[PDB]
Design a protein around this ligand. Sequence first.
Ligand SMILES: Cc1ccc(N)cc1C(=O)N[C@H](C)c1cccc2ccccc12
Ligand SMILES: [Cl-]
Ligand SMILES: [Cl-]
Ligand SMILES: [Zn+2]
Length: 317
Amino acid sequence: ASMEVKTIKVFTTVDNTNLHTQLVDMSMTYGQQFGPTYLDGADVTKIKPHVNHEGKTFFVLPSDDTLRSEAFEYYHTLDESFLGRYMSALNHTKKWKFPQVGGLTSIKWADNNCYLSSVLLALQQLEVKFNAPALQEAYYRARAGDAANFCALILAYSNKTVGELGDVRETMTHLLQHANLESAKRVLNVVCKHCGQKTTTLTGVEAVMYMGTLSYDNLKTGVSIPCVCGRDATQYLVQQESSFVMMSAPPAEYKLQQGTFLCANEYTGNYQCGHYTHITAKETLYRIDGAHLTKMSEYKGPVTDVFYKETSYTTTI
Ligand SMILES: Cc1ccc(N)cc1C(=O)N[C@H](C)c1cccc2ccccc12
Ligand SMILES: [Cl-]
Ligand SMILES: [Cl-]
Ligand SMILES: [Zn+2]
């Protein structure tokens, strides 16, 4: 338009909470004035300002102490490439569909996001709290059906990109590290027939996840494990302090009886290239597969993860 000095008022941010007013020179690009810049996850580093941009909020990278501090307080990470991978992933997740299925927010399949849909579904049924404000907020919105952000954060925290199939268990591990499980505790009694006995105590994420069996009952009765030497020593739960536990194991035909578990995940296909679907229950058993739901009276299939509700448990040994 009118050839003259033109500068518009926009806002820059790293957490979308603290907004920094900026007067930009329309005669140059965002990159030249802010460095890598984003608008709704879309990279606009190489373009110049538009009047349509007045009053809009742009994401930039932590280029100064204030920004570094703000980004850290919000996301709780020091990974320099975090903000970038997040915007990059959000640029895609914002196009996904998040239908309500069985009363839970699910995700229409796209880009092998079935493992993310399983994670999201599981979370909504667990008493779990995040410490990173970034996740508290995005999670709150996902429960209402607007999970584009929450999905992008999960991808960024577990350092995966849109398109690649991930492992639910492993993804929960990365994710739960930013949850409040500071009071989660597990005490295991190990007994090697030969070399006596000891007691192992796990806390945080390690206190709620187990790999080997899908049965929480077995963990309580005893499960074998390779000893320093000799055979496989026995091990069993003595104390459990958490709002839930997750029992994992390689997919295998398993029967799931309603009332005996919280929710679970089945996986069909080959290692790293199969398909996940979520199993839960309300009035009956529900099989949630993205935007698909199937109600059944009984279930038996390839299960890898089973969640159980917990408060506090102690042995009768
Ligand atoms: C989807 C995915 C992405 C990344 C990585 N690293 C792993 C997986 C993955 O295949 N996980 C499933 C549940 C799995 C785990 C353990 C043993 C399994 C044996 C046979 C078939 C599946 C098996
Ligand atoms: Cl939360
Ligand atoms: Cl349960
Ligand atoms: Zn031994």
